[PDB]
Amino acid sequence: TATYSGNPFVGVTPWANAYYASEVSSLAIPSLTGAMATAAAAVAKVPSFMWLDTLDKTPLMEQTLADIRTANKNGGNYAGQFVVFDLPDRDCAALASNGEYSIADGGVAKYKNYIDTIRQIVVEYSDIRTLLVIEPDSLANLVTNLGTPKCANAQSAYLECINYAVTQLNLPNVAMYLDAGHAGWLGWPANQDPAAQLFANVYKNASSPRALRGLATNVANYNGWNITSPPSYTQGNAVYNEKLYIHAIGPLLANHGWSNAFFITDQGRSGKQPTGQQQWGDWCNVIGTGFGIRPSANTGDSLLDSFVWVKPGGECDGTSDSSAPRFDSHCALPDALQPAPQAGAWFQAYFVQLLTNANPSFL
Numbered sequence: 262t263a264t265y266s267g268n269p270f271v272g273v274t275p276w277a278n279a280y281y282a283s284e285v286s287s288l289a290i291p292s293l294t295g296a297m298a299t300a301a302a303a304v305a306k307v308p309s310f311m312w313l314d315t316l317d318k319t320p321l322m323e324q325t326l327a328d329i330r331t332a333n334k335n336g337g338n339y340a341g342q343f344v345v346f347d348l349p350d351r352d353c354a355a356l357a358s359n360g361e362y363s364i365a366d367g368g369v370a371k372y373k374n375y376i377d378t379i380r381q382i383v384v385e386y387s388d389i390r391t392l393l394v395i396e397p398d399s400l401a402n403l404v405t406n407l408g409t410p411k412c413a414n415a416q417s418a419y420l421e422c423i424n425y426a427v428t429q430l431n432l433p434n435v436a437m438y439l440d441a442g443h444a445g446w447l448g449w450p451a452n453q454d455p456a457a458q459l460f461a462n463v464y465k466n467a468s469s470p471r472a473l474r475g476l477a478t479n480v481a482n483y484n485g486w487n488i489t490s491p492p493s494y495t496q497g498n499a500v501y502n503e504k505l506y507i508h509a510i511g512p513l514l515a516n517h518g519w520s521n522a523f524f525i526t527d528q529g530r531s532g533k534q535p536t537g538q539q540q541w542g543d544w545c546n547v548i549g550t551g552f553g554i555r556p557s558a559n560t561g562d563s564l565l566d567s568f569v570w571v572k573p574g575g576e577c578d579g580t581s582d583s584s585a586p587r588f589d590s591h592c593a594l595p596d597a598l599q600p601a602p603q604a605g606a607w608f609q610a611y612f613v614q615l616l617t618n619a620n621p622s623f624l
């Protein structure tokens with residue numbers, strides 16, 4: 262049951278990790294009352310992805326897989342879900358990056374060690390199907406942000422590191438999905454082909470890895486999956502939702518050598534449409550959002566393997582504190598909820614917002 266054919270989401274149930282469940286029960290619930298905290302308890306049972314944003318997060322991955330092995334040894338049929346996110350000079354186009362490795366200070370070698378560490382864990386838990394999202398906010402920058410010096414200089418490192426990750430994690434119990442931005446980034450007509458070309462090149466350059474199932478879209482973003490009317494901030498783009506995006510880029514990938522590419526789409530913060538975004542490019546702790554379509558493989562779509570919740574709702578995108586290190590001005594915009602703590606830290610007011618605006622509702 263660890264190995265699979267076709268859609269890796271079919272035949273298993275994604276695991277709802279203890280890490281996120283702890284945050285909800287210990288940081289959120291003690292502050293909620295009645296209907297609200299009962300609804301919060303339910304959110305903790307919805308499976309979401311765990312982010313390995315630092316090397317010191319790897320022991321947590323092993324800990325999670327141990328829990329799953331027991332659950333399965335205890336009759337479960339669960340699969341792990343993780344995000345590989347520690348590229349050197351990470352988020353090259355961002356005003357502030359929390360990435361621990363730098364290309365200038367042997368970041369490529371450090372990244373390979375990080376991948377070697379993850380591989381050993383996956384080989385150790387060969388009995389568990391592991392679903393992985395590979396490096397969000399990486400390759401998309403190579404399509405539109407080469408005008409930014411940091412991205413231009415990180416191009417070779419990004420491609421070398423991604424090749425290593427994809428080849429070293431190419432195992433029977435693994436299913437990988439390369440991050441491919443979203444409709445508002447690569448969905449624009451002029452960006453579709455250049456993007457398809459790059460992703461197809463990465464695939465073929467890694468010798469068409471069996472484990473590389475396809476692409477992941479809308480990660481940590483808020484686009485709707487199949488909304489019938491275009492939000493004002495999408496003006497000028499015919500591809501205004503994720504469904505239109507994957508169906509546009511799908512055939513293009515085939516034209517470039519990558520046939521049979523499938524997709525997964527983040528809907529964890531897409532429940533309320535339109536959102537409170539004043540501009541499509543606004544990504545930090547956006548106001549007017551809610552939990553969206555629940556994770557499921559019954560997508561009613563030919564290209565979507567599953568709806569997923571990659572970015573865990575409640576965990577901060579970045580701080581709004583100007584006197585704080587790693588401060589990004591995008592988190593201080595009128596459509597960003599404030600005050601916001603450090604990236605990854607629990608953001609209670611944001612969690613309550615998502616819970617209140619949820620669709621399907623939890624209340």
Ligand SMILES: *[C@@H]1O[C@H](CO)[C@@H](O)[C@H](O)[C@H]1NC(C)=O
Nearest residue numbers: 417420421424462463466467
């Ligand atoms: C192909 O793989 C090599 C490493 O073997 C890497 O250096 C190169 O950047 C990759 N090229 C592309 C287009 O992915």
Ligand SMILES: *[C@@H]1O[C@H](CO)[C@@H](O)[C@H](O)[C@H]1NC(C)=O
Nearest residue numbers: 486487488489554559560561
């Ligand atoms: C959008 O997708 C959801 C989930 O598959 C479905 O319930 C809904 O009917 C769809 N709406 C439209 C307009 O296609």
Ligand SMILES: *[C@H]1O[C@H](CO)[C@@H](O)[C@H](O)[C@@H]1O
Nearest residue numbers: 262263264265266433434
């Ligand atoms: C998935 O594939 C493995 C071998 O790669 C088999 O042992 C298993 O039964 C399933 O077919």
Ligand SMILES: *[C@H]1O[C@H](CO)[C@@H](O)[C@H](O)[C@@H]1O
Nearest residue numbers: 272273274275337338339
């Ligand atoms: C996880 O749990 C679901 C129940 O919704 C099963 O259908 C699946 O086979 C796995 O055991």
Ligand SMILES: *[C@H]1O[C@H](CO)[C@@H](O)[C@H](O)[C@@H]1O
Nearest residue numbers: 279280281283284287288
């Ligand atoms: C359970 O785990 C979460 C995530 O680390 C903590 O925030 C919480 O305090 C508890 O230890």
Ligand SMILES: *[C@H]1O[C@H](CO)[C@@H](O)[C@H](O)[C@@H]1O
Nearest residue numbers: 282283286302303305306
């Ligand atoms: C944290 O713990 C509480 C109480 O056990 C649960 O209700 C919640 O779902 C989460 O697991």
Ligand SMILES: *[C@H]1O[C@H](CO)[C@@H](O)[C@H](O)[C@@H]1O
Nearest residue numbers: 282283284285286287288
């Ligand atoms: C959240 O963390 C607290 C300890 O800080 C636990 O008591 C609780 O059960 C949950 O794991």
Ligand SMILES: *[C@H]1O[C@H](CO)[C@@H](O)[C@H](O)[C@@H]1O
Nearest residue numbers: 288289290291292293609
């Ligand atoms: C729950 O959230 C409240 C804020 O509404 C905090 O005061 C409390 O410490 C807990 O984090």
Ligand SMILES: *[C@H]1O[C@H](CO)[C@@H](O)[C@H](O)[C@@H]1O
Nearest residue numbers: 294295296297298299300
């Ligand atoms: C939500 O509902 C549950 C079930 O009655 C309660 O235990 C909780 O206190 C909240 O009111």
